[PDB]
Amino acid sequence: IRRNVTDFKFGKELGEGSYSTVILATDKITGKQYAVKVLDKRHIIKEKKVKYVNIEKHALNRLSNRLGVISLYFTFQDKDSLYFVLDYASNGELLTLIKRYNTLNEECTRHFGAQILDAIKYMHDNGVIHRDLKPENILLDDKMRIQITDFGTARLLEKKNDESEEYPVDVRAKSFVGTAEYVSPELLENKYCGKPGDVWAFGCIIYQMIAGKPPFKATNEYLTFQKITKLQFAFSAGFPTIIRDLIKKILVLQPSRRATIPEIQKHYFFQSVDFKDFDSIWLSDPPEIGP
């Protein structure tokens, strides 16, 4: 026969939202676990998040089934709700992995860092700029490999056969949900972002992977925005200089002076990594997790 919705076994809730709800689903025949994202239509109409939904859907249609990102297998809907059957990341968020031992070692940071950089590289290649990058939306699959979700704030480009879609991201607004610590300075200021924005966020992420806390972590958001706009971040006493230089050339106010992806690839910290041997990036045995 064929495959349909009735072949599924819905289980635990993987986390609700302000307009969405992720529920664990399991194929009764194959055993393959998925993550069904249930969105209430009236909730996205009342707040006009249809553009977010379409940007996410479009990004998922762009980014096909690769290892670095969550993939949308199929979709279905009734009259009140819309359903997104996605990938299931067994090992939760990257933030939880970081908060496991507070910090991470240099080897693991290089590993998962190469993974993340590869993912971002792929996204930028397929004309997708996530803009909103943070350890909250970086998950880990069953075999301990990173993935990227929440493509609602993404940006599209090439206009090859599908056109470009860039909508402003007012961080200081009320519609913005998040901590806004991993937000690029230009994105905070002029409500728009480019490729080096995800690079900035990447720098914040690896900095957090070593130190244990975001580079621009503050009490409120005034001091946060102040730290972002004044570049007020200081490395810890015992901090790897090799990574320190990388952060210093990544976390830069001017996006033009900011280090690009291939430059990060050709860094002294990533000389131990070949980004063409992507069997070593993904299928490698994850190093002993620890601080």
From Swiss-Prot:
Gene symbol of the encoding locus: PKH2
Region described as PIF-pocket: 39-84
Residues at which ATP binds: S18, Y19, S20, K37, D87, Y88, A89, E93, E136, D150
Listed name of the protein: Serine/threonine-protein kinase PKH2
Free-text comment on this protein's domains from its UniProt entry: The PIF-pocket is a small lobe in the catalytic domain required by the enzyme for the binding to the hydrophobic motif of its substrates. It is an allosteric regulatory site that can accommodate small compounds acting as allosteric inhibitors.
Annotated function: Serine/threonine-protein kinase which is part sphingolipid-mediated signaling pathway that is required for the internalization step of endocytosis by regulating eisosome assembly and organization, and modulating the organization of the plasma membrane. Phosphorylates and activates PKC1. Activates YPK1 and YPK2, 2 components of signaling cascade required for maintenance of cell wall integrity. Required for stress-induced P-body assembly and regulates global mRNA decay at the deadenylation step.
Consequence of gene disruption: Sensitive to cell wall-damaging agents SDS and Congo red.
Subcellular location: Nucleus; Cytoplasm, Cell cortex
Family note: Belongs to the protein kinase superfamily. AGC Ser/Thr protein kinase family. PDPK1 subfamily.
Range of the intact protein held here: 233 to 523 of 947
Active site residues of this protein: D132 (proton acceptor)
Higher taxonomy: Eukaryota, Fungi, Dikarya, Ascomycota, Saccharomycotina
Residue span, Protein kinase domain: 8-270
Organism: Candida albicans (strain SC5314 / ATCC MYA-2876)
